[PDB]
């Protein structure tokens, strides 16, 4: 019972602590990077079509 309560307290402390914002910061970086790469590719295609 003591080990279970200690584990529950550790889980609650981890949930309350602001330290989970790692994925929601790492993944959007590469997501918007790929988005900007696609935008640059579309801009190059538009410039080629205009030429």
């Amino acid at each position: 019972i003591l080990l279970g309560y200690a584990g529950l307290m550790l889980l609650t402390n981890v949930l309350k602590a602001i330290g989970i914002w790692g994925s929601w910061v790492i993944a959007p970086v590469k997501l918007i990077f790929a988005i900007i790469k696609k935008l640059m590719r579309t801009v190059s295609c538009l410039m080629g079509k205009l030429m």
């Binding site: 959007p28 970086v29 918007i32 990077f33 988005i35």
Partner: peptide, 9 residues
Amino acid sequence: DRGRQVIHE
């Protein structure tokens, strides 16, 4: 990396 993220987001 921080500057790239600031430019991207």
